[PDB]
Design a protein around this ligand. Structure first.
Ligand SMILES: [Zn+2]
Ligand SMILES: [Zn+2]
Ligand SMILES: [Zn+2]
Ligand SMILES: [Zn+2]
Lengths: 74, 79
DNA sequence: CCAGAACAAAATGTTCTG
DNA sequence: CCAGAACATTTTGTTCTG
């Protein structure tokens, strides 16, 4: 397709198994490797789009996983 | 009290007219000196505590405004 | 073309100085 | 005590290298 499946910015290729942009790729790797235990400040349903992808690591990461991102993709 | 009224961290003094920590103080000064065209990803009531104050500058700024913060606070107090 | 590194920028937080 | 500044860290994002 065309746009990132996590944040709807334009995607840069298939990363960790899913079409995504560069920032989401590294965010996802950092999230998993850092074990940050992110906590949403709203209702676990934050809108994650181009401007607001910084707004909630908990929801962004959740949206990553739901899109099927995984580190040992291939 | 001595906890920040914006985020409930340890307040460090009365800054721009309200008990706040140093981080909220400078966050507000910066929001006020420049642009604060932020956008909330939830429902404009995000919970602002020590860790999550980073998540939503839109709501963090709102809770500063709502607490009465203003730059001329200290000068107005001397009047 | 992609993962991870390395570099860079944005955003946040702390100590210094008037 | 508290303002702004200066210094410092964190967080996110882009380009480079394997
Ligand atoms: Zn993305
Ligand atoms: Zn959220
Ligand atoms: Zn605070
Ligand atoms: Zn918010």
């Amino acid at each position: 397709s065309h746009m990132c499946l996590v944040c709807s910015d334009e995607a840069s290729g298939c990363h960790y198994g899913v079409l995504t942009c560069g920032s989401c790729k590294v965010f996802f790797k950092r999230a998993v490797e850092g074990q940050h235990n992110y906590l949403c400040a709203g209702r676990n349903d934050c809108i994650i789009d181009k401007i607001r992808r910084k707004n909630c690591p908990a929801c962004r990461y959740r949206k990553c996983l739901q899109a099927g991102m995984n580190l040992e993709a291939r």
